[PDB]
Amino acid sequence: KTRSSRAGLQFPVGRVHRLLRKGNYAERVGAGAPVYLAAVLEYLTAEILELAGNAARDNKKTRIIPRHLQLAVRNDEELNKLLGRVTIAQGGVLPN
Amino acid sequence: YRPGTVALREIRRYQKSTELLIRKLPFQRLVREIAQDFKTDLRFQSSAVMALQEASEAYLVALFEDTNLCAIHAKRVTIMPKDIQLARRIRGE
Amino acid sequence: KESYAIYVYKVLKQVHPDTGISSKAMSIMNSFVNDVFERIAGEASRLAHYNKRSTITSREIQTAVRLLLPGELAKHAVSEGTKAVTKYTSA
């Protein structure tokens, strides 16, 4: 029913389309833009959640915490580049 | 323990750790002192002080990590003020 | 007072249903997604303004992804976006 299901996506196509219309990014937006943006956001989130999953798994921890997020995102040089300026609250350094 | 190993031990420890190193109240008193210069009528959310200490500690740790590279490039191992001045001048601040 | 938490749980359960996540880590994710959204929308706006166009469509986000993302991330993200919009328009 919801456009996300029509696209086969989990992310809220409605909310993102609303935000795009609200944010004065342009006077007009095409119907493809919000679904495409939801797609790429869901992909990137899936990637980082995967890596954090592994960062918890080998620490034997059943539950993701920020330390795992930092351990993930700083190991992947591409995601580290994408987040090159980002600071993660309570994210310690990588051991070296 | 063998001589000097304490440094290596505590390096490995504090790299493993994640918690804040600075005392909370001293930091709060500091940021209040700095702020009251700009306006006496002031309040803080505690979370704002947390964010401030988090950002400042991250920035300091990054600057240390760079200046360590400066020191080792000079083939010292003791960090020296001129290292800090250089690293800041390279980064731009 | 919208936030992404439930969607994060959906993707989490898809990738790794075995494991929970801290509310702190959720707040990190909610920051990250908003940041990257603002960034990509800003770039798409800059593109549309540059072309003197009135509107944002798929082609603008498609180019902005190729600008903002690392090459391999772009290569996969643009594919996922193409698949998504293909399904949506076919449906």
């Binding site: 899936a46 990637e47 592994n54 351990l71 993930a72 | 063998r2 190993t5 | 898809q14 990738v15």
Partner: peptide, 24 residues
């Protein structure tokens, strides 16, 4: 499990447990 990355990232260790018996 439902989603899998294509990206051929290397294997990674994230374990940060360590000892001090090298120092003793």
């Amino acid at each position: 499990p439902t989603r899998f990355s294509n990206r051929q990232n290397k294997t990674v260790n994230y374990n940060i447990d360590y000892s001090d018996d090298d120092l003793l």
